[PDB]
From a paper:
Here, we describe a phage tailspike protein, named K2-2, that specifically depolymerizes the K2 capsular polysaccharide (CPS) of K. pneumoniae into tetrasaccharide repeating units. During the initial stage of infection, the tailspike proteins (TSPs) of bacteriophage recognize specific polysaccharides on the surface of the host cell and attach to them for adsorption. TSPs, also known as polysaccharide depolymerases, have the function of binding and digesting CPS. TSPs typically consist of three domains: an N-terminal particle-binding domain that connects to the tail structure or baseplate of the phage, a receptor-binding domain that extends from the homotrimeric structure and is responsible for host recognition and catalytic activity, and a C-terminal domain that plays a vital role in trimer formation, receptor binding, and intra-molecular chaperone functions.
Specifically, two subunits are assembled into a dimer of a parallel left-handed helix, and two such dimers combine to form a right-handed superhelix. The two dimers superimpose well with each other, and also with any two adjacent subunits in the trimeric wild-type structure, presumably sharing a common interface. Notably, as determined by top agar assay, this tetrameric form of K2-2C-His possessed a significant capsule degradation activity towards the K2 K. pneumoniae. Conceivably, although the electron density corresponding to the C-terminal His-tag was not visible in all subunits, the protruding His-tag might give rise to steric hindrance that interfered with the assembly of the enzyme into a trimer. Finally, the structural and functional characterization of the tetrameric form of K2-2 here demonstrates, for the first time in the field of TPSs, that a functional intersubunit catalytic center could be formed without the need for trimerization.
Numbering used by the authors:
A (entry chain A): 148 to 440
B (entry chain B): 148 to 166, 179 to 206, 213 to 262, 268 to 578
C (entry chain D): 16 to 167, 179 to 206, 213 to 440
D (entry chain C): 11 to 293
Amino acid sequence: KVRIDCSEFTGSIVFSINSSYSYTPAAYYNNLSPALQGLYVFGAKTSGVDGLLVGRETVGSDKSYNGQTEVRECTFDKFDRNIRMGHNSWRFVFYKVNSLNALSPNGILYVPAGLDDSGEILSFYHCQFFDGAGSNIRLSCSSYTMVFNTCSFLNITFFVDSASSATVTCNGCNFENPGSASTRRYVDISAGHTNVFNIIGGSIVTNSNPGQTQALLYVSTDNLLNLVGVTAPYGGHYQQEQELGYHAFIGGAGTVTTSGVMLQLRNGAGTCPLHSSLSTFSNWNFGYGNLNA
Amino acid sequence: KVRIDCSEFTGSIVFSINSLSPALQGLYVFGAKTSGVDGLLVGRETVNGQTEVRECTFDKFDRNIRMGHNSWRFVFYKVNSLNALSPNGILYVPAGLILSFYHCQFFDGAGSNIRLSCSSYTMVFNTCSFLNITFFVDSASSATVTCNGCNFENPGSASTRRYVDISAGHTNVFNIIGGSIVTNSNPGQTQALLYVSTDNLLNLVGVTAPYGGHYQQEQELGYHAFIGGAGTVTTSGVMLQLRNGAGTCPLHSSLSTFSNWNFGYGNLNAWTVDKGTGTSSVVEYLANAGPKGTEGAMRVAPVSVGTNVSQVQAVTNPGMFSMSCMVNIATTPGNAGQVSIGFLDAAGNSLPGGVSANLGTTTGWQVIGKNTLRGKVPIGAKQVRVNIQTVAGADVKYAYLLCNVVKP
Amino acid sequence: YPQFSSMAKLKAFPHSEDGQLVRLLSWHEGVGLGGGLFKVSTSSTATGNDGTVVVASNGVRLLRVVNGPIWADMFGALPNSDIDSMPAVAAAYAYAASVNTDLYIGVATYKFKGSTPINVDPSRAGIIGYQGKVRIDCSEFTGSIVFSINSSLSPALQGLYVFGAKTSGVDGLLVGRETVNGQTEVRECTFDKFDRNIRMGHNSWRFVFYKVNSLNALSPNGILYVPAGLDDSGEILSFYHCQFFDGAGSNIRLSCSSYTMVFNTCSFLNITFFVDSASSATVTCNGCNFENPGSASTRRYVDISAGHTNVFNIIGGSIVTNSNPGQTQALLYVSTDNLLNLVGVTAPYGGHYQQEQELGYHAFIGGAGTVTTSGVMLQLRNGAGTCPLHSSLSTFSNWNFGYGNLNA
Amino acid sequence: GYSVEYPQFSSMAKLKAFPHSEDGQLVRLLSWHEGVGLGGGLFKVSTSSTATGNDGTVVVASNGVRLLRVVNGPIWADMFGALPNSDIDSMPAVAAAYAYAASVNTDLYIGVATYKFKGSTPINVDPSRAGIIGYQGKVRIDCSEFTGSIVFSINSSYSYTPAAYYNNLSPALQGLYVFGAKTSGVDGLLVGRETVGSDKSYNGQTEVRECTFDKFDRNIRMGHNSWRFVFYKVNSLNALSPNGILYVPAGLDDSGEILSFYHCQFFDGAGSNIRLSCSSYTM
């Protein structure tokens, strides 16, 4: 129950977490105690003031051994970027960490491209990511692997535009639009190649809005979206045909796979197919240029 | 940062845990790699609560962490284990005995590894990392290991050690879900980094299979693939690195798209042989003629006109594929021929997304298909057809025609 | 002094007082690097370079008051940052060459982006790390070559670890030019993860390589490539204590005719040395090691595969063969009309030798060329055994019954 | 004319004793030792820094405020208080300077002079991180009073990368005339390590250049992981041991690949010789 009011702080970052060692004793000590615990840290949405920097702003003379560092039971609120990955952002674990109401469009959680010695299993357990006023999560770094376990993504979009080899795994997470009338996507893998997004279990909740004019899940060419053990939602406000030209849940020219997915066959409003890549029938869109098949 | 120096401790084990605070928390416990001196024993050496070890590091013991007989449910959180003396020193579950690990790091063994040898034993790792160590599973029967969101890597290492080696027993299961498998370039990866033995299973879900130019697993297997062993491999939502400039390889024999791919039938069945007008062209099965000299091979020496050997099988979107071939050109006028992969719908119509690999003129056993025979399964595809074309006047042996379409 | 926090602020201000001294705190805002005193000149028409000559927005020149050496930070290079430093380093080198002084680069990591090569003119200036482990990250560079060395003395390049990301079509170092006296050296540099790490082009200068490392290239000729057609490059290419290793499929290929290369105390590890020049290529290796360390791979060490009158000399040094499943092919190959001379070196033997699979008989060297031996030693006390080297060294006539009879 | 560009301090002691209070302020150290005119430079005052003091590049004032040296180029020993031509043991200052230099992957330079090395603590050069370079090749190191097992060892801290990238980029030792007094048990240079480590040491491409080792027990001795070292213009002379000029003992691990010597002079006449006893060794 410690609250840190940073409304009058004008620095670039309030907290940074980075080891002073390249190997030992960091390989013995990082895991013994949390780096930050029990702190509710909030600002006043001042431009240029970030909450937490994970790693360092610039590449060090040597590597910084940050593996096994923990941020626990903390909230970062009303900063420009609440949590930002820097160099040497590897094997950090966030347990019961909340990020909310950030100023930047990437303010909830930002992983910029170009990071050195970063990307090994950035883990989040029981974390809450929330906004609704334009801030989102964006993963832009290549060869970056993140795991979210029992986390909540509320009124935000999870953007992945890494050039290559991003892997996001969500186990038991809930994606929801509570209170909001926004048509924003839940997950948007918009660029690069060999990017993988896994939705394993959890729930996808789609509360009614004026009309869902775009697909809530989007996977671009050469990327993969895997749905495992999850129920595909349906609502009468679903109007994804405005974007795609047809009534389907997922957009984009990437690939979707389905394992243990359920449909709401019991929904009075109806049910829709998930993605073009799951088409049962050949020449489904008459893309052959003829009527063959 | 509490530091427990056990370099002069001469006992069998330093700590034991036997019967909701954690049992241990906040301790760096290290030894001097003295033989017979173990760090942590979970349970007793001789034959219903939940207990936890958090925020501890075990280092430089014979066996850092060892499981014993105990009925309590154990959970590890932010535990490091590194640099042990015993070959099983990182973590050892002996035979004759759910164990859960969260954000634990098992690394820098310098010869020490993880070994699960206990039958009917279940282990779960979440957001853990296994670095410069091997994970052995030689349980007699029914061992289960599930790694969700974990990383297997060789950071800064030249070693060709395996990442996962399921080496014995039956009905042992190893699941890799999400996370990452990273293979930094080394002097040459001449053995498979994943191995699943007979009657055992390796399941890969939602993880990207890496590729690197240093991959040389054919030295062990006789053919270019990622996983060895006569067990079974399943894939669901697995991504292949189709745009990797060095190439891509199939994953396992158990995922072969085509029948009689290794000519283990003892014949050329399942392969459609079309000599064309070249009735004189010879297409024969040759025993003990492949790369290892212990496997079948198909020799094709066309005369006057080329010969095409093909096989078609069922496949459908969604899917990704990669194929490798073992080819030995004895002699050829020019380009010896071409291996090609095409897709068709159920009505036989050819579809876009076909790929081909030219055989060239170099003699001797060689891998074909690395950066050529790969891609995405086109939408609406219902059949996949491989065709092996050999030009007239060329004499070529073919072996291990391994294609994988990674999908459920 | 009047103070400006950044180059942008310095350029934007309307400087009007001739001779006035102003202080630049830093080239980039807040970094505290690249700053210094500048003198306003209203008469100067010198070309701006954003380093020693700054042209303000109003056209007034500011001339850097230099107290000491030129640093790339003075031209806007940002060490240990994700910003592209190549324009600043290129501009700094251009100034350095203009005053016939080497460009010193401080120890740090620099990112090279874009597609514009830097051409080092060794008759004017080299690029020298001062002093330590300087890293030049070219992973995002998309040009044909990062560095070229061409005039048409201090070393041209020294103390630099230059690496890419194995992007196809992006080469590391080109010595000479793409199209048709003087001596210059490349020393203490590492080239890593390019398509072709080092490629020879057209040039009349005698190049010497000292303590140069080349490894892990994408191209099959990626370690070191001497293409055919280099008629204008008549000088001997010399290498001293250079390491060519861990190619991950990349190799050395000499394809140019009438071309001579000399290697002294170099190591060729986990790579093949190819020579396929049409005629009159000469490679001499004195005190070199050819080995397959850590990977135990069966790939050939030396393959003189084509042409005529090509000579490969192995003088002293060592040929080491680590054990594998089976050495099913000869590690040394010399084709028809070519010559491999072995002098004062020990031929190795191992029980894994299975060269009869390729040759039909048990011998160390393959090919229909010629092998000579002077002062060569055999491992006569090797318990696994010993084998003959080559057919061309046959003691007895009609040894293979190639006469078509039993004569002799 | 009594104005100065930056606040000036005549010695390291005065710099540390002053109560620095203005964050970011640039101050000038005229010299490490008062009046000597060596080791000076510009320092940036930092009140936020928690970096460990080393009395060279990171200075901690008496009030705890850090002063950070503005360094352009290699590290010099006189930045850490090393004094030319002195009777005081210079090995602690050079060891401290090298420790920082290696920590930032930068070579250590030593100014032209004669230095005395006393005590018994060897300097272990990590060729993957930093070398020790005598300025203009005219550095003399008097080890007559050194009682340790070896003056210098050269061994990498890595088993593979980045040693495969860095070892070649600069010499491990250059421009040093190192001599002892033939006291038994004191060796000059150890190439590799004394004992087999848990992992191998990637020492390939490491260079000793323009150095002389003289009047030691064994001047140059090969240890474990002694592979692909190159010695250029290195001289070994007047050693005590019968194998003192250059000794390769038997039993060495991960050793023997192309140990190379260019323009080296091996001379004695008083009983010391070269002996290669290790198997599978190529020189």
